Amino acid sequence: TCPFYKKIPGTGFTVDAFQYGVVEGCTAYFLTHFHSDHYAGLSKHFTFPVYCSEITGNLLKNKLHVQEQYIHPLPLDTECIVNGVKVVLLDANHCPGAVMILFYLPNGTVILHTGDFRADPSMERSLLADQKVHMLYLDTTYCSPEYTFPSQQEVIRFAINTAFEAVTLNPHALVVCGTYSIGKEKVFLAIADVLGSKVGMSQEKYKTLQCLNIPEINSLITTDMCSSLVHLLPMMQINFKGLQSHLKKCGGKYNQILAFRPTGWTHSNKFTRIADVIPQTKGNISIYGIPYSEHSSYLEMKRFVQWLKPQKIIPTVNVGTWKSRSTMEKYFREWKLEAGY
Ligand code: NI
């Protein structure tokens, strides 16, 4: 049974609710972004209308084989009418194709569902700025003050300089980057660009990246591993055993691996600055964990909510424990009292 916080009252609508079978009274199923916890349940046999971004619709069609007739892509930043209700899709600053959804209810209520997002001050000048929002369905993944991490730009700077230094010192070093889903493509694209290489990867990964509308992509990626000095691998293979095994397969082209694991937050963030990060090393293999987040930090979240001034907040993440729920409700009340709404 679909939980309440995936339902949009006063509509026939659900958000990211594909694992519950046929939801009673749902006339249109919205998908915020192509991540498995959200899409769970979609497949080629789905016969209800799905509303999403153009990128998300590319992935539904090519990766999950949903039939075209049921995929309804919408342009961003544009007022659209779906089953007699006005909606707008906004960029979520999450993974490619990820959106927030504004719903304009027939009774005058205005609802924002953030899906998964990284709040940014640039959002304060989207179509949100022009009207009041009564209810906010909020991505609360890192809704606690201990969650700090750097900007995405500083993290990319760290990785570029790290990889460029290592490979200039040793031209026979291979760089490997871990991946398990879409998002965080900047990590491996930025590194390959500084090294003047393409990024090499499996045919299944190449296919997924071809759905994303990234400019000049045929110039940046490839399935020819032999021609590339930045390789992508499954995240599970980013360990000493997996990387040694991969270095065997490269046929004496390389004698050193430098690898990156983009994580979200890790407790080394409560002590260490990005500048100060060090790898784990064993022989000729080094592994850096880098805190490249596609979710709001605590401070970024607080600023967005205090700017938006919603009347009611409904969390969509960390909802399974009473301790988590109680913690989030405390911060929401603090924020409301400090800002005065
Ligand atoms: Ni996500």
Curated annotation (Swiss-Prot):
Enumerate the Gene Ontology biological process terms.
cell division; double-strand break repair via nonhomologous end joining; interstrand cross-link repair
Q: Does the keyword Nucleus apply?
A: yes
User: Which UniProt keywords are given for this protein, alphabetically ordered?
Assistant: Cell cycle, Cell division, DNA damage, DNA repair, Hydrolase, Isopeptide bond, Metal-binding, Mitosis, Nucleus, Phosphoprotein, Ubl conjugation, Zinc, Zinc-finger
Q: What induces it?
A: During mitosis. The mRNA encoding this protein contains an internal ribosome entry site (IRES) in its 5'-UTR. This 5'-UTR generally suppresses translation while specifically promoting expression during mitosis, when cap-dependent translation may be impaired.
Quote the cellular component terms of the Gene Ontology held in the record. fibrillar center; nucleoplasm
Stated family:
Belongs to the DNA repair metallo-beta-lactamase (DRMBL) family.
Q: Does the keyword Zinc apply?
A: yes
Report the function annotation for this chain.
Answer: May be required for DNA interstrand cross-link repair. Also required for checkpoint mediated cell cycle arrest in early prophase in response to mitotic spindle poisons. Possesses beta-lactamase activity, catalyzing the hydrolysis of penicillin G and nitrocefin. Exhibits no activity towards other beta-lactam antibiotic classes including cephalosporins (cefotaxime) and carbapenems (imipenem).
Name of the protein described by the UniProt record: DNA cross-link repair 1A protein
Main localization (coarse): nucleus
Q: So which tissues is this one expressed in?
A: Expressed in brain, heart, kidney, liver, pancreas, placenta and skeletal muscle.
Annotated Gene Ontology MF terms?
Answer: 5'-3' DNA exonuclease activity; beta-lactamase activity; damaged DNA binding; zinc ion binding
What are the subcellular locations of this protein?
Nucleus
Q: How does it assemble?
A: Binds constitutively to TP53BP1. Binds CDC27, which is itself a component of the anaphase promoting complex (APC). Binds PIAS1.
